[PDB]
């Protein structure tokens, strides 16, 4: 299944001409047309939402923000964390801490005005987002990567205690996903060792 959000397909299927989010190409919950928006950096505006409200994000920070957009919109497994009473929303998707930490590090000197990027905006007539709070650095907005990942999208994400049973929006998620859906920990960690070996 896919999420029952604005843009999602009914069911995951291959998607040949994706411009971004290609991690999900051969089984995607987004149509390729959605990806066109993300093909060019700097990314100013995705759908009705401006990404540059406190300035233009550094490239690596933008990359991380794009990875989460691609997951929500295109991952064939996001719906496994579907909120049953709000079918466009996810809850408690387990993110790897290393992922959240690298992200924070990438964004630490960038600026932001929404502690929670989903709720903390003024939305105008045309659906476009405007800061209410003040622009501050990410390093002021959140105390660390963990705090950021638990805050940015409310209940959507959590930070796993496990370094293996967690998503980081790269090919290793194929290892994680097998075990997410003590024992499972060791299974995952062995599987992950094989993965790292196979990739030269």
Ligand X SMILES: *[C@@H]1O[C@H](CO)[C@@H](O)[C@H](O)[C@H]1NC(C)=O
CB neighbours of 84 closer than 8 A, spacing ≥ 6?
Answer: none
| φ, ψ (nearest 5 deg) of residue 10 | -75, -40
Per CB under 6 A, which of residues 144..163 are in contact with ligand X?
144, 146-147
3-state secondary structure of 95: strand
Stretch that binds ligand X, among 73-81, 123-131, 141-149, 175-183 (CB under 6 A): 141-149
Residue closer to ligand X by CB (options 147, 185) is 147
Residue 31: contacted member of Cl ion, ligand X, none (CB under 5 to 8 Å, by partner type): ligand X
Q: Would you say 34 or 51 has its CB closer to ligand X?
A: 34
Residue 31 within binding range of ligand X, rule CB under 6 A: yes
39 binds ligand X (CB under 6 A): no
**121-123/129-131 β-pairing:** antiparallel
Binding map of ligand X across residues 71-110, x = CB under 6 A, - = no contact: ----------------------------------------
Query: Is there a contact between 101 and 144 (Cβ–Cβ < 8 Å)?
Result: yes
Distances from the Cα of 53 to the Cα of 73, 175, 180, angstroms: 22, 36, 36
Stretch binding Cl ion (CB under 5 A), from 25-33, 81-89, 181-189, 192-200: 25-33
Closest CA to 145 of 188, 105, 199: 105
Please state, in angstroms and rounded to a whole number, the distance separating the CA atoms of residues 138 and 144.
9
Nearer Cβ to Cl ion, position 25 or 87?
Answer: 25
Residues in contact with ligand X by CB under 6 A are 31, 33, 143-144, 146-147
Residues in contact with Cl ion by CB under 5 A are 17, 32
């Amino acid at each position: 299944g896919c999420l029952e959000g604005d843009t999602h397909k009914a069911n995951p299927s291959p998607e040949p001409n994706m411009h971004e989010c290609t991690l999900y190409s051969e089984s995607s919950c987004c149509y390729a047309n959605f990806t066109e928006q993300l093909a060019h950096s700097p990314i100013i505006k995705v759908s009705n939402s401006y990404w540059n409200r406190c300035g233009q994000l550094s490239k690596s920070c933008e990359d991380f923000t794009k990875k989460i957009e691609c997951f929500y919109r295109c991952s064939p497994h996001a719906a496994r964390w579907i909120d049953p009473r709000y079918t466009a929303a996810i809850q408690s998707v387990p993110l790897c801490q290393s992922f959240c930490d690298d992200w924070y590090e990438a964004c630490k000197d960038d600026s932001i005005c929404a502690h929670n990027w989903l709720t903390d905006w003024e939305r105008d007539e045309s659906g476009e987002n405007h800061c209410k709070s003040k622009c501050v650095p990410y390093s002021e907005m959140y105390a660390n990567g963990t705090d950021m990942c638990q805050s940015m999208w409310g209940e959507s994400f959590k930070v796993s205690e496990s370094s293996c049973l967690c998503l980081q929006m790269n090919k290793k998620d194929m290892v994680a996903i097998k075990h997410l859906l003590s024992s499972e920990e060791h299974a995952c960690q062995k599987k992950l060792l094989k993965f790292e070996a196979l990739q030269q």
